[PDB]
Amino acid sequence: RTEIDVMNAAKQSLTRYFGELLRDDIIEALGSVVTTGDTTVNYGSASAANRN
Amino acid sequence: MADFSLATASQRKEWSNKAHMEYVRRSRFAPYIRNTENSIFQGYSDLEKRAGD
Secondary structure (H helix, E strand, C coil): CCCCCHHHHHHHHHHCHHHHHHHHHHHHHHCCEECCCCCEECCCCCCHHHHC | CCCCCCCCCCCCCCCCCCCCCCCCCCCCCHHHEECCCCCCEECCCCCCCCCCC
């Protein structure tokens, strides 16, 4: 029904998603919570006792 | 009989390789489907080219 190449538009937008996926992990790593000795829990999935 | 009497369950069979089909009766509209302008059922190959819906 179209003439535009959906294949090449889906391969370019797929290399460009794994670049946004990398700095979304560095922002999540900087806001981590270090409980006790290499135990880094993310801020959303941390309890009130892990933050204290 | 009391010659060499072979068993009822020991008699050979044979299965053929040539199979039959069912008749189809191809089409009664077949001499009337053309691509010209003076045909009853007219065909268009314009979407067989580049693109369309």
